[PDB]
């Protein structure tokens with residue numbers, strides 16, 4: 386599309402979008418246009434408001450668009466077009482992407498005993514409540530574990546909450562420890578969000594014992 | 598009072614205040630308490646809402662307090678008290694101060710001719726639409742002009758808009774130019790807001806001719 390300001394809105398939280406170039410108070414010649422999961426192509430919202438959209442998004446006195454609680458279906462394009470007292474036309478363009486942070490990831494069914502030279506199920510990492518899905522990754526003593534390599538194998542699984550649409554991730558790690566290695570390695574798991582500039586969450590490490 | 602987070606809210610703009618430690622969605626055991634120009638001591642606001650206060654401030658689904666258009670009377674203390682699913686009590690304390698930026702200051706009735714050795718009316722600086730009042734200051738070639746020093750005299754005036762309560766400032770500068778000075782000095786005027794970390798606004802300079 387066109388050049389836009391990217392907005393990352395957290396699910397459940399309010400969102401205010403500024404209509405640039407609008408008078409600070411009524412009277413106002415402005416209109417918002419949005420194309421989201423809630424619309425069939427473009428929907429026009431006006432200061433006068435009215436109808437079902439009043440429960441989703443309303444134009445504020447200063448012309449900004451206000452959404453009291455952002456949802457998954459509010460992802461999309463939000464545009465404002467305004468005329469000021471001097472007659473200049475000003476346009477605002479926002480690309481809104483929504484997200485939710487999962488709870489802290491947890492390692493379940495961890496092994497306490499690993500045999501070197503044979504495949505071993507190390508553990509299962511679980512992360513619940515993310516949007517977008519994001520990914521789970523494993524770490525050995527700080528170094529990321531690369532799947533399908535040095536005897537490392539990972540299986541992954543994704544479920545969706547039937548009501549909220551938030552994602553639960555599950556990742557099982559299997560390793561074949563090399564003969565003559567660290568007898569007490571430290572394994573950990575991290576959740577990486579799908580969105581840029583978002584922090585990664587890490588589990589408490591597990592430290593099984595290995596048989597050389 | 599108690600330790601608080603300072604909030605500077607612009608008049609006419611929405612304000613969202615987070616209720617820390619609250620569940621992200623209803624059901625919620627929280628309450629807001631506010632003491633502002635609108636209240637007689639403390640007023641309690643609840644998620645259920647209702648009554649005239651619904652037109653001024655409402656608790657959002659995530660527990661935050663939302664004011665669609667802040668006014669002068671909204672200055673004051675805003676507190677939230679919340680219990681989470683684990684039973685921990687969390688308190689939020691906000692000291693809200695409101696403001697409005699005036700229009701660009703202007704010099705009117707500026708003189709084109711100053712006689713050195715006698716008092717001369719240099720000009721009158723005008724700033725309209727500020728809250729809080731703020732102050733007007735004069736500058737000679739970048740250097741601030743200190744009133745009642747070196748033949749400098751300033752007279753000041755403050756008016757209030759009868760409906761909006763915003764302030765209009767007026768400042769008249771008189772100087773006695775020293776014999777043997779800059780034949781074309783540059784005078785300017787600046788508005789300094791009453792609130793900290795807010796930028797100063799400066800007028801276009803005036804450059805009269807001075808009389809040796």
Ligand SMILES: O=C(O)c1cc2ccc(I)cc2[nH]1
Pocket residue numbers: 413414415416466467468474
């Ligand atoms: O209500 C009106 O008269 C009015 C609405 C509106 C929306 C965008 C532009 I550019 C001018 C406008 N004028």
Ligand SMILES: O=C(O)c1cc2ccc(I)cc2[nH]1
Pocket residue numbers: 387388416417418464465466476477478
């Ligand atoms: O009338 C409106 O709401 C409106 C239309 C429109 C077209 C391109 C861009 I960038 C912003 C816009 N805003």
Ligand SMILES: O=C(O)c1cc2ccc(I)cc2[nH]1
Pocket residue numbers: 439440441442443451452453
């Ligand atoms: O029924 C109500 O009290 C009520 C719901 C609702 C949804 C979005 C907006 I903006 C204002 C609202 N008021």
Ligand SMILES: O=C(O)c1cc2ccc(I)cc2[nH]1
Pocket residue numbers: 443444445446451665
């Ligand atoms: O002027 C008013 O009373 C007023 C208008 C208006 C529009 C959207 C929302 I959310 C709150 C509002 N309050």
Ligand SMILES: O=C(O)c1cc2ccc(I)cc2[nH]1
Pocket residue numbers: 626627628678679680686687
């Ligand atoms: O009656 C209720 O449900 C209720 C409200 C409320 C507000 C703050 C705190 I700490 C506990 C609370 N319990």
Ligand SMILES: O=C(O)c1cc2ccc(I)cc2[nH]1
Pocket residue numbers: 651652653654655663665
């Ligand atoms: O125009 C309306 O129906 C309307 C007024 C109004 C005042 C405060 C809040 I929070 C929401 C509002 N909606």
Ligand SMILES: O=C(O)c1cc2ccc(I)cc2[nH]1
Pocket residue numbers: 453623644655656657658663
């Ligand atoms: O979940 C609730 O009780 C609740 C809905 C809702 C919609 C608009 C506004 I402003 C405040 C709200 N609070």
Ligand SMILES: O=C(O)c1cc2ccc(I)cc2[nH]1
Pocket residue numbers: 599630676677678688689690
């Ligand atoms: O109702 C109360 O007793 C009460 C609530 C509340 C919220 C924040 C702070 I700092 C002090 C408080 N006292």
Ligand SMILES: [Cl-]
Pocket residue numbers: 423424425426427428
């Ligand atoms: Cl539609």
Ligand SMILES: [Cl-]
Pocket residue numbers: 635636637638639640
């Ligand atoms: Cl009261």
